Amino acid sequence: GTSKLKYVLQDARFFLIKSNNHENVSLAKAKGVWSTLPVNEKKLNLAFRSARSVILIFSVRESGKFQGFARLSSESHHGGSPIHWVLPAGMSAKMLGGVFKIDWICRRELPFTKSAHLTNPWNEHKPVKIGRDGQEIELECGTQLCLLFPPDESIDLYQVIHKM
Ligand SMILES: CNc1nc(Cl)nc2c1ncn2CC1CCCCC1
C-alpha cells in the first residue's frame, strides 16, 4: 500500500539531486550514502534539522528519468569510510567530502514523461524534472512526484518511520 509512504512524506521537505553519472547513484543505493557540493551540503544540513523528513529525489544527467528517492537519516559527516565516487570533470574528492546517511524509500526508476503534469513553484513552475542539483521542490509537488514512482516492494518503511 501507500499509507506508510504518505506518512513518511507528511510535512517533508524535498530536494532534487542531479548526478552527472549512474555510478554514484548506484554506489548511493548500495551504501546508503550521498555527498554533494558544499553549497547544497549546507542547505541539506539546515533542512535536516527543520523537518520530520528530508527527501532526496535522484536524477542522473541525460537519463531522462529519476532513479528513486531516499530520506536523510543524518547530517553530513567527515572522516568516515571513504566513498569511491566517480568524480566528474573539474570535480575533486574534497568537494564531495561530507557524507550524509540516507535510507532509500524507492530504488525504482520514474521516466520524466510521467511527471510532465507536475510543476515546481520554487523553480518558476517549470516541470519538476527541471532544476539544478539541490533545487528544493515544494511540498505538494514533491509529494505527488514521490507518489508517482512504482512501489518498491523490497523496502519496509517501518524502520524509516521509527527514525522520525
Ligand atoms: C556523489 N555526488 C555527485 N556525483 C556526481 Cl557524478 N555529480 C554530482 C554529485 N553532486 C552534484 N552533482 C552534479 C554537479 C553539477 C555541477 C558540477 C559538479 C557536479
From Swiss-Prot:
Tyrosine phosphorylated. The modification Phosphoserine is found at residues 81, 92. Changing residue 37 to T: Reduced binding to N6-methyladenosine (m6A)-containing RNAs. RNA binds at residues 18-20, 34-35, 85, 133. Changing residue 34 to A: Abolishes binding to N6-methyladenosine (m6A)-containing RNAs. Abolishes binding to m6A-containing mRNAs. It is found in: Nucleus; Nucleus speckle. Changing residue 104 to D: Does not affect ability to influence alternative splice site selection. Changing residue 18 to L: Does not affect ability to influence alternative splice site selection. Changing residue 34 to D: Abolishes RNA-binding and ability to influence alternative splice site selection. Transmembrane segments: none annotated. Changing residue 132 to F: Reduced binding affinity for N6-methyladenosine (m6A)-containing RNAs by 9-fold. Changing residue 19 to A: Does not affect ability to influence alternative splice site selection. Interacts with SRSF1. Interacts with SRSF2. Interacts with SRSF3. Interacts with SRSF7. Interacts with SRSF10. Interacts with CPSF6. Interacts with KHDRBS1/SAM68. Interacts with TRA2B. Interacts with KHDRBS3. Interacts with EMD. Interacts with RBMX. Interacts with ZCCHC8. Regulator of alternative splicing that specifically recognizes and binds N6-methyladenosine (m6A)-containing RNAs. M6A is a modification present at internal sites of mRNAs and some non-coding RNAs and plays a role in the efficiency of mRNA splicing, processing and stability. Acts as a key regulator of exon-inclusion or exon-skipping during alternative splicing via interaction with mRNA splicing factors SRSF3 and SRSF10. This is YTH domain-containing protein 1. It comes from Homo sapiens (Human). The chain holds residues 345 to 507 of 727 of the full protein.
